[PDB]
Design a protein around this ligand. Structure first.
Ligand SMILES: N=C(N)NOCCNC(=O)Cc1c(Cl)ccc(NCC(F)(F)c2ccccc2)c1F
Lengths: 11, 249, 26
């Protein structure tokens, strides 16, 4: 449902 | 938000989205009160009856948003949390009394057309504006009915008299709460709902034209039921704790 | 210090669509 956010934040 | 409207761009530049890392989802609303402090509801982070207990690392705050699901490139900012502070006397066992939490951002965020802090009420602003019949404004990406909006929703709701709030529920109401919404016989509707929690209830001062955050979306029973009302954390009553946390940490 | 004043509204002296409703209740 949600658009992926940049990988760096998922850190 | 139930029975609300699409917000205009930049209408609530203090609106913050609490975003779970994984699974990626919307947790709650929140509000920006300075360049690195974010105000929200405690139950958004800590609620043992539902095995909910998030930490600094489970969460992201996304600021300056309008679309609920899109990654708003060059517009929104995403921040990590350094520390979370829950009110010591937050009462999750009984009635969500003192439903409030502060979050310190890893790094200060830069303001823009879409990102700007709301004011916290002083004693006099609170005294003058927190009255039955005055209207405040609630915003969030929460459920549309007791299904989910594409953009931020807004609804204006009147403050309700204390006796009426009390007689509408079996839950024990405290001075740290107020309720808001239309009466069954007023013809207009609207309420916050699941997903809106932690969001701001704001009012515009007729004296200095500034927006002040009077409440935090806390709880209710269902959403937008006749003869029921939304309950909000009374921000000013808890301001001493807010101020204390800030100038200490 | 600059709290509660929106870049796209108060700062430009533009009103949003429903703020009048708030003011009229006070
Ligand atoms: N304005 C609204 N229409 N809702 O407000 C935003 C949605 N917020 C919540 O869903 C949080 C919440 C939680 Cl965590 C637990 C219970 C309830 N409601 C049940 C109860 F009302 F019975 C109750 C109240 C407080 C303590 C124990 C039980 C509750 F609303």
């Amino acid at each position: 449902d949600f658009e992926e956010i940049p990988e760096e934040y998922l850190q | 938000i139930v029975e609300g409207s699409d917000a205009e761009i930049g209408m609530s530049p203090w609106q913050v989205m609490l975003f779970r890392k994984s699974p990626q989802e919307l947790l709650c609303g929140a509000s920006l009160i300075s360049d690195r402090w974010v105000l929200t509801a405690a139950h958004c982070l800590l609620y043992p009856p539902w095995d909910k207990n998030f930490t600094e690392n489970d969460l992201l705050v996304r600021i300056g948003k309008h679309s609920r699901t899109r990654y708003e490139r060059n517009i929104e900012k995403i921040s990590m949390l350094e520390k979370i502070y829950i009110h010591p006397r937050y009462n999750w066992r009984e009635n969500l009394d003192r439903d409030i939490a502060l979050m310190k951002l890893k790094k200060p965020v830069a303001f823009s057309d879409y990102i700007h802090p709301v004011c916290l009420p002083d004693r006099e602003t609170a005294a003058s504006l927190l009255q039955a019949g005055y209207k405040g404004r609630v915003t969030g990406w929460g459920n549309l009915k007791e299904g989910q909006p594409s953009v931020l929703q807004v609804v204006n709701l009147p403050i309700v008299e204390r006796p009426v709030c009390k007689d509408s529920t079996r839950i024990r109401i405290t001075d740290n709460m107020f309720c808001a919404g239309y009466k069954p016989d007023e013809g207009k509707r609207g309420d916050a709902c699941e997903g809106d929690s932690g969001g701001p209830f704001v009012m515009k001062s007729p004296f200095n034209n500034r927006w002040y955050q009077m409440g935090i979306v806390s709880w209710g029973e269902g959403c937008d039921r006749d003869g029921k009302y939304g309950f909000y954390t009374h921000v000013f009553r808890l301001k001493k704790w807010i101020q204390k946390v800030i100038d200490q940490f | 210090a600059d709290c509660g004043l929106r870049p796209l509204f108060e700062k430009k002296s533009l009103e949003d669509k429903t703020e009048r409703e708030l003011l009229e209740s006070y």
